[PDB]
Amino acid sequence: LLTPDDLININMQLQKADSAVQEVTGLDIKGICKALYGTFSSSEKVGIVPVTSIGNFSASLHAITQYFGFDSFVTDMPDVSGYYEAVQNGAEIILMADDRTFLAHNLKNGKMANNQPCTGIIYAEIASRYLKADSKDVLVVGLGKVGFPGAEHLVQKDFRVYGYDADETLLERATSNLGIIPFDPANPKKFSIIFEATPCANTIPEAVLSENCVLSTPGIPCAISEELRDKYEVQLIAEPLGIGTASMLYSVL
Ligand SMILES: NC(=O)c1ccc[n+]([C@@H]2O[C@H](COP(=O)([O-])OP(=O)(O)OC[C@H]3O[C@@H](n4cnc5c(N)ncnc54)[C@H](O)[C@@H]3O)[C@@H](O)[C@H]2O)c1
Ligand SMILES: NCCCC[C@@H](N)C(=O)NCCC[C@H](N)C(=O)O
Ligand SMILES: [Mg+2]
Ligand code: NA
C-alpha cells in the first residue's frame, strides 16, 4: 500500500521528467520510447506480479503503467500463484522482479526485457538527443549493469564516449570491449552531455560541468549536490522507476 504522499510523488516525478525530457530533447518519455524501439502501445494488458523474494513496488508499477496508458493490474496472489493468476486473467505482458532481476515478458511475441539495460539505454538515448548539444562528446560515469549498456548505445550512435568507473577491472573491460575512452576524473575536460549510473552521491566533479549541461541519471542518490546543479544550471533528467519501466514495455511491444 502506497501512502498518499507516495502516490502523489510518483505522478509528480513522472510529469517533472516528461517536461524535462521535452525541454532537453523535444519529445516526451513516450516519444523517446517510440523513436528508440519503433513500437507503439495499444493499451496492452499488463499483469504485475508481486514477488516475496514486499512494500509498494507492485503498487508503484501499477501507478507508473497507468500513467503511460497501459491496462495494468496487480495480482491478488504473489509468486507462482500470482503468475498463474496474471496469465489466466489475460495478461499479455508480465511485469515482475526479485532483488536481482526486474523483467517484462511479452507472452504474445515472446520478447523479454531486463530493467538494467533498458534503463541505461533510454537514459543514454535521452542524453544523446540534447538539441542544443554542439558536441558529440559524452561522459559516462558508472559502467555497471545500467551504465555499460548505456555507453554501448552511445557508441552505436557514433558519439565520442568517455567513460569512468571506480572499479578499475570493469573500466578496463569496458574500454577494450566497446571503444570508450577511459576518463581520468582529474582530466579538467568539460562536458555538455553526461550520463551517470551509480548508487553513489557526488560522482560528477565540478570541473567536468559546463553551463546548462544535460545530466541524465537513473542513479540514486543524486550524482551532484543541489548546490552544483543550481550553480551550473544543470538540466537534470532523473526519476526513480518509471522511465526505465517505460523503456522495458516499449522494447517488448
Ligand atoms: N531510476 C531507475 O529507474 C533505475 C533502474 C535501475 C537501476 N537504478 C539504479 O541505478 C544505479 C546503478 O545500478 P547498476 O545495476 O548499474 O549498479 P552496478 O553496481 O551494476 O553499477 C554501479 C557502478 O557504479 C560504479 N561507481 C560507484 N561509485 C563510483 C564513482 N564515484 N565514480 C564512478 N563509478 C562509480 C561502481 O564501480 C559500479 O560498477 C543504482 O543506484 C540502481 O539502484 C535506477
Ligand atoms: N533502483 C531501482 C532498481 C531496482 C532495485 C531492486 N533491488 C529492487 O528493489 N527490485 C524490486 C523487488 C520487488 C519485490 N520483489 C516486490 O515485488 O515487492
Ligand atoms: Mg527511471
Ligand atoms: Na548516483
Resolution to 1 decimal, in Å?
Answer: 2.2
Instruction: Tally the C-alpha atoms within 13 A of residue 185's C-alpha that lie toward its C-beta.
Output: 13
Task: Please tell me if the domain spanning 1-114+239-253 has the same topology as the one spanning 115-238.
Answer: yes
Q: Is 145 annotated as a binding residue?
A: yes
Sort residue 99 into left (φ over 0), alpha (ψ -120 to 50) or beta: alpha
- Render the burial of 196-207: b for 16+ CB within 10 Å, e for the rest: bbbeeeebbeee
Strand arrangement of the beta sheet that strand 235-237 belongs to: 181-182, 160-164, 137-141, 191-196, 209-216, 235-237
Asked if 117 and 149 count as a contact pair (C-beta separation under 8 A), the reply is yes
Identify the residue whose cell numbers are 486473467. Answer: 89
Given the DSSP bridges, would you call strands 112-114 and 181-182 parallel, antiparallel or unpaired?
Answer: unpaired
Quote the Cα angle for 10-13-17, to 5°. 135
Cα-to-chain-centroid distance, residue 232: 23
Q: Is residue 166 in contact with ligand 1, taking CB distance under 6 Å?
A: yes
Give first-to-last CA distance, the chain, whole Å.
Answer: 29
Q: Domain-by-domain residue ranges, the chain?
A: 1-114+239-253, 115-238
Please name the method used to determine this structure: X-ray
Residue nearest to atom 18 of ligand 2 (CA): 54
Q: CB count, 10 Å around CB of 30?
A: 17
| 3-state SS assignment for residue 243 | helix
Q: How far is the CA of 215 from the centre of ligand 4 (A)?
A: 11
Q: How far is the CA of 52 from the centre of ligand 2 (A)?
A: 10
Identify the residue whose cell numbers are 502516490. Answer: 7
Pocket lining for ligand 2, CB < 6 angstroms: 50-51, 53-54, 57-58, 97-99, 102, 220
Enter the CATH code of domain 115-238.
3.40.50.720
Q: Which atom of ligand 1 is nearest to the CA of 119?
A: 5
Q: How far is the CA of 238 from the centre of ligand 3 (A)?
A: 7
Beta bridge partners of 139: 162, 194
**3-class secondary structure for 66-135?**
HHCCCEEEECCCCHHHHHHHHHHCCCCEEEEECCCCEEEEECCCCCEEEHHHHHHHHHHHHHHCCCCCCC
Instruction: Tally the C-alpha atoms within 13 A of residue 207's C-alpha that lie toward its C-beta.
Output: 6
Beta bridge partners of 71: 45
CATH architecture, range 1-114+239-253: 3-Layer(aba) Sandwich (3.40)
